[PDB]
Paper text:
pmcWDR5, a well-established core scaffolding protein found in histone methyltransferase complexes MLL1-4 and SET1A/B, was initially characterized as an epigenetic histone “writer” to recognize histone H3 lysine 4 (H3K4) and is essential for H3K4 di- and tri-methylation (H3K4me2 and H3K4me3) to activate gene transcription. The residues Val31-Cys334 of [name] are visible and consist of seven WD40 repeats that form a seven-bladed β-propeller structure.
Based on the structural analysis provided earlier, we hypothesized that amino acid substitution within the [name] peptide sequence will alter its binding mode with [name]. To test this hypothesis, we crystallized the [name]-SET1B1745-1754 ([name]/[name]) complex. The structure of the [name]-SET1B1745-1754 ([name]/[name]) complex was successfully solved at 2.10 Å resolution. Van der Waals contacts are observed between the side chain of Val1751 in the peptide and the aliphatic portions of [name] Lys259 and Tyr260. The backbone amide group of Phe1752 in the SET1B1745-1754 ([name]/[name]) peptide forms a hydrogen bond with the carbonyl oxygen of [name] Lys259. In addition, the side chain of Phe1752 points into the [name] Tyr191-related B site. Furthermore, a hydrogen-bonding network is employed by three water molecules to enhance the interactions between [name] and the SET1B1745-1754 ([name]/[name]) peptide. Consequently, it is evident that the [name] [name] site and B site could be recognized simultaneously by [name] motif peptides containing the ′′Arg-Cys/Ser-Arg-Val-Phe′′ sequence.
Numbering used by the authors:
A (entry chain D): 1745 to 1753
B (entry chain A): 32 to 334
Amino acid sequence: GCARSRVFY
Amino acid sequence: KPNYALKFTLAGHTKAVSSVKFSPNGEWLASSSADKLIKIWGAYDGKFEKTISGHKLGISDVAWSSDSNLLVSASDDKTLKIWDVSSGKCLKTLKGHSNYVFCCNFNPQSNLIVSGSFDESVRIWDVKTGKCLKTLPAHSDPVSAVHFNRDGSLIVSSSYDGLCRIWDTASGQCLKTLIDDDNPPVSFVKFSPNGKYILAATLDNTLKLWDYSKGKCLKTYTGHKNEKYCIFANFSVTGGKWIVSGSEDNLVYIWNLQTKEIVQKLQGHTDVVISTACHPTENIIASAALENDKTIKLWKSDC
């Protein structure tokens, strides 16, 4: 994945 | 009211699309993805142009240089990469963040790149050399967005820590902090095209138009769903003056900027619309969605 496509923090 | 209608669906990424940006010259759409690739598409015919690769983890953001010749990308591999668009070659690897790089942008003169990272810093990089010129201790949580104003003298940054900050590019000093008495995490921020305003998304399903000098909230846009992801929002200026944003209910929302009324919702994506972009001269919107969808859609309006 990538950080933006994962739930933010 | 506008009448955006679907024109193309652009398939080919194998994981969630994270970001789409039109080239300043209007010819191209660039898209970044969790699949580690950047893809270049024709803005007017939707035709796939090329794939640019080299990041060894997913990419959360991509941005064009003002002359449309370069791209910069931000990756979970903790680096940014500067790409020559025509050749597809990696011209520089920007190293120094200690966690995922989340967001990036050139300044208008395109001699600088600004990046924000999960490491809670904002970095300012020299494009020619790839050197990091400044590390700003910007925030106490991941930085969700970074953006230059129209002359590049100001940077605006946002963070999960709930703050919007305005920085003097040359000195690196924080000129202004916006707070909301509540801390919703701030998931996106950018200057208005004129630089007088800032558009800020917060993870309470709310977009706000701010006068950063005055420190006043001018406008609030609601009705969409935004609680989990950092969704891009935009000023649409080629026809009617709209606010455009993705939404976690898989729709594209378009509001009248002045009245705050919803004027259109674009249906067809099958996952969170993480990203929208507005074409620089035509009434064209690009939208892109997450893992259940993986496609980019191009929409066209008469106004």
